Subunit: 313 residues, 4 copies
């Protein structure tokens, strides 16, 4: 039975990757941060073959400890302070987690394989944010011009990973993923912010609702992560839908799906075009969920959520 | 108007202290951690009532984030409540715990000192001390009772205690150490024994749960009400001179007695649901904690208003309502 | 009187830059690490009243950085501090990244926090390295893409971007000096050039017999640290902040270095050199040669010391150093 | 062949412990920090294949565990630290991360090692009398701690992390609560070496003034060469414990001045001037240990007494000063 270790398992991607690997018969171990409040909202339904362990990317000891006890076959580093805006607020912390944290995991894995003679496949959660202002089309080889501490930190993590591959021959893959959403997307993100409101509005619990992007479904993307680690050789891959859409187009589809006009609730207050050819060719990966289905999917779940709220009220 | 800066505002004590200070007319500022999930459940109702309560992103392991907000806020009082506060968890992540509970407290102290000197302002500081620092030292424990920490968390609290005392003695910083004993409430973290019990009890009463797993039932603790204790933190900073005070009810009870009172209050025999699992036992345990709050009573005039029985019943009532709320969702087919 | 704060002042570049700035009438402050041993060998002479002040701090300690920035209120900041050895970076990657990458960010953030809190204005220099280009083919210029081959290199790439991000995001006057290999008689003895000349001078006096090296094929663009520190200062004297490659636009291999140095003393390096695998890096950087057209045209900077002169300048020093040692050893002083 | 891993091997104690263990037939490994300058001045004369140096840092957990796995040491001596008390007030955060958390990282790396490999390791923590702070003497193992500096509070923390790993996991970890100990290898920024180093230069005419701070502070001074032996002894017992290592004799900085200068026929009052900058924000007034337990259980006792220690340091620094004068009048420096 293959064993997988996931950092950032409580996040959006972690929650889906967990379900995916389980369906694959994998034994899944995830590292979680201690917090004063419930923090396993995305994987609660799963917990009730999945083990959770306390750890932190800023604590190298905690990382090596669990890798030694778990002896994973595949390690997915999805953990990070993933909010771009917030990264300007806590740059040091973000760098320590996103950049150095990644290096700690890499070094913990390399050290482990040398001490135990074992083999480990590694995945680094890269981001299209690394490209920054570089003009399209952005592929695996496009140069980075990060525009935030978060992006710069991901660039560093990307390079530490590549370095461990070329220097030690570690099976380390960099998934350069573009924006992906889902019903579990953090509410601090535009797509989820919108669908959350709509559900509330429809239920009548809410009154008002406060650069284009390549949005894909988180469920599809984690599959590409797994595919990367199943190839013969380690490599870096861009994962995107290669299509664009606007927040308004999102509003129309979202609100239109529930028979509401967005102009009755809307309250007015970069340029990434990825080439995922390599992913399609080498991994045979293809998004099986389009923009429309993704939106209506988010809307349905957020409505079910609003109703749960109306019932309580 | 008085400006207060609270670290660990999202926690149990932080939520109560916030309500208490706002009640005193304070302008409250709190530092929070970015999380992939909702993390302001305890203070949401206050924030939604940006004005008198602002929240800022920071981390006790990031010294820059601390100094930055101290400079921006120019607080009059600083309450360091932030911490990886679970004892059992500290054995699993000692390094992270130490960096936050020990060095983290030092980072704040040093950020406050640098601020007051660079800007000439004055700040009163409060450090969230714990009875856990006494460790195995026999009760009753007072301000003069020696420490003998039994976990990485406790040893880190002692360090934070000494860093604080040092900044007071070395720089004249008005810094106080609140040596608080266990204090609970309906907002207590669910992974702590008292909350874990009343939460499970409430579910059992409504048929949503049937078995409750616990560890050492013979451990004895001095349990007060967090609502009462946050007042003591405030009092400490109002005195003429800084000092350290033990805050407790001076009444001790075992976990088993907590079970008797809680379950018995709802007409059930906990022995019918409770089961023991070695996984909840800790490498090094703290057997008996009971404080002597004579100094707080005499100097701060502080006295706990909520007693043990009332606290237990308060938590049971709240968690029962919670369980019923969940029961309604299951009944309506909204919850699985 | 301008005030400059130099991190990594005890290092090679730090010592030269300090002299250069003092010669310009600057008040120089340096941040130094506490150590159980003497660690100011390169700057101790700068004393022989106090235009050079040293303060205890560390790039892994954000508070220590902001602390001296507030007290010093500098006009210019030069971040030269770093775990600068590439081979060592493969051994202690975590620490290296924390000093070279996050450490640079801590300084940047401390400077920005300082300017916003005091309304003051500060100019900032980041010590970038040609090592960032890694395996990318030469000649490498400011537009050449990076492909780091070591944790150190990757970390310098991070610092580069953090620096660029602060300039673009907050309008901070921050420049990236993309300096290529630069040696001097003060160069660390664990780097190839100094290792060679030091061993040479000693071999020449009978103090040493065998010199162990790694990859002699490695080609590099070697300049003189004394010349390069001037470019750092010029960069900050411009109207607008930018990034510049500082090099000699001439590459030579380590063997060529070995030919010139030993031959200069009429010796045949092949008679004393041996190859040890331990000195090979897990991932190597083959050829580095810069394109400093931008520095010349904009800063008006040009390297005064050529390769030959550099090698002979280093050999002369270490030879005289080896001779003095021999005298002290012969006299029973060492 | 016994294997020892020493953190802080380049420091005073590390250099003596290395010699002591090598003389005991040990294979010694030491962790050193990468630096821009030569940093092995104290152990160069040793480094002919039983002493290995590896790059690491107490603020880098990975680096620690890494070498512990490769080396698989039987005994670990944690002497690594930002050991200057005055400096600790200026860089409290770093000092804490190294002295307190750094000690915890090593303990956790050793525990993780022994659990993952099944091997056994004996651990020594370099505790200090500074932990007692202002608590009045005599100070023994159980005397309450009242740290007066970030350094001391960090040592107090390291002390408890160490005791906790012993009580919680049964790890063989001992806390050596050592009082001040000097030697000709002592750091020049410490009062004793500062004084003897200056005295020597004054005697040969290379220096004229010596600036100091509080001369009334009282300390229990022993010889590092003697103390490192107590460290080894603690780990040779059947059970782990904590022991105070001291001379039990206290003296003031002034007495140190009378003895050292008087030894060369000089009056220190003619060269010493008080500088307010050398005073610590919070001072440690009087330290005198009770090393009964060490003598009774370890059979350990100091060989070098106060005056002998002072004269030892003065002799070396005088000869060093004379040798400098010669190199000065020659153009070598
Ligand atoms: N989603 C996207 O569109 C894009 C995301 N990515 C990246 O892919 C990864 C997954 O994204 P996503 O699921 O949306 O992110 P989320 O923000 O939903 O989840 C982040 C996860 O990281 C954990 N984490 C944060 N800090 C630490 C720490 N110090 N130690 C350990 N764990 C920590 C979080 O824990 P906790 O719950 O406690 O906060 C959470 O589990 C991230 O690295 C993200 O940057 C890449 C491209 C785009
Ligand atoms: N409660 C008790 O009975 C006793 C507790 N204490 C101490 O008093 C304080 C308050 O207790 P309590 O409210 O119950 O504790 P909680 O665990 O409920 O709250 C801890 C708080 O600290 C925050 N925090 C944790 N790590 C960090 C970090 N690295 N940076 C910033 N913030 C962080 C938490 O944030 P987040 O929500 O994201 O996790 C939360 O706000 C704590 O220090 C605790 O150890 C002392 C004696 C008694
Ligand atoms: N010289 C070259 O050929 C090239 C160098 N560079 C870079 O330019 C800078 C200067 O180079 P160079 O003078 O030769 O390097 P050195 O290695 O000689 O000097 C490094 C300096 O950084 C200090 N330092 C290291 N770690 C820390 C820390 N954690 N906190 C504070 N200070 C620290 C060192 O202190 P300590 O003495 O205590 O060790 C020393 O002062 C470095 O960043 C280097 O990487 C760029 C291109 C080429
Ligand atoms: N000496 C005394 O009188 C007393 C001292 N002690 C303690 O005993 C120990 C030995 O003392 P002593 O020899 O005099 O101290 P020194 O200051 O001479 O030596 C300290 C050692 O620790 C190393 N070190 C410092 N920081 C780090 C770090 N971050 N990572 C790795 N290594 C590091 C130093 O390296 P580097 O050379 O690079 O600086 C040096 O090898 C110390 O822990 C000290 O605090 C306790 C009681 C008494
Ligand atoms: C004062 C102190 O109170 C709390 O620290 P404590 O360790 O005293 O609180 P906790 O409620 O966790 O445990 C109290 C005692 O009950 C035992 N116990 C029995 N079964 C269980 C169980 O299943 N879970 C937990 N968590 N504890 C259990 C414990 O072993 C212990 O003996 C925290 O809030 C600290 O942060 C704070 O400093
Ligand atoms: C520009 C770059 O220069 C320096 O980094 P570098 O790695 O370019 O310089 P170094 O002198 O270490 O090596 C140059 C080339 O020669 C090879 N070499 C062969 N044998 C040896 C040997 O024994 N020791 C060393 N140190 N190098 C050896 C190296 O492998 C490499 O190919 C540092 O100052 C960096 O901080 C800076 O960023
Ligand atoms: C035991 C303890 O000893 C040492 O810590 P200490 O602080 O005891 O050593 P130090 O020699 O620095 O000071 C001893 C006492 O003399 C006073 N003193 C007077 N003038 C001066 C002066 O100019 N410099 C210094 N450094 N000290 C001066 C000090 O204030 C103090 O009262 C370190 O080795 C620690 O790491 C170790 O833990």
């Amino acid at each position: 039975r293959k064993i997988a270790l996931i950092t950032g398992i409580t996040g959006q991607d972690g929650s889906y990757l967990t379900e995916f690997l389980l369906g694959k018969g994998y034994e899944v171990h995830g590292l979680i941060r201690r917090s004063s409040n419930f923090n396993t909202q995305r994987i609660n339904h799963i917990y009730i073959l999945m083990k959770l362990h306390y750890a932190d990317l800023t604590d190298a000891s905690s990382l090596r400890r669990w890798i030694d006890v778990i002896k994973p076959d595949e390690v997915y580093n999805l953990a990070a302070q993933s909010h771009v805006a917030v990264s300007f607020e806590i740059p040091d912390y973000t760098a320590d987690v996103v950049a150095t944290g990644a290096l700690r995991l890499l070094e913990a894995v390399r050290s482990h394989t040398i001490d135990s003679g074992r083999t480990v496949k590694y995945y680094q959660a890269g981001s299209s944010e690394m490209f920054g202002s570089t003009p399209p089309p952005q592929s695996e080889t496009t140069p980075f011009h990060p525009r935030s501490p978060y992006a710069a930190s991901k660039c560093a993590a990307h390079w530490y990973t590549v370095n461990y591959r070329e220097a030690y021959g570690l099976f380390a893959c960099n998934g350069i993923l573009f924006n992906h959403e889902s019903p579990r997307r953090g509410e601090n993100f535009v797509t989820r912010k919108i669908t959350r409101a709509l559900g509330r509005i429809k239920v009548g619990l809410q009154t008002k609702l406060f650069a284009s992007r390549d949005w894909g479904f988180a469920g599809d993307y984690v599959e590409a992560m797994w595919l990367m680690l199943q190839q013969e050789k380690p490599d870096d891959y861009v994962v995107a839908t290669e299509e664009g859409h606007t927040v308004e187009e999102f509003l129309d589809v979202s609100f239109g799906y529930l028979g509401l006009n967005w102009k009755d609730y809307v309250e007015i207050d970069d340029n990434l075009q990825g080439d995922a050819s390599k992913a399609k060719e080498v991994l045979g990966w293809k998004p099986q969920v389009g923009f429309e289905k993704l939106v209506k999917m988010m809307v349905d779940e957020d409505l079910e959520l609003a109703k749960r709220e109306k019932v309580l009220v």
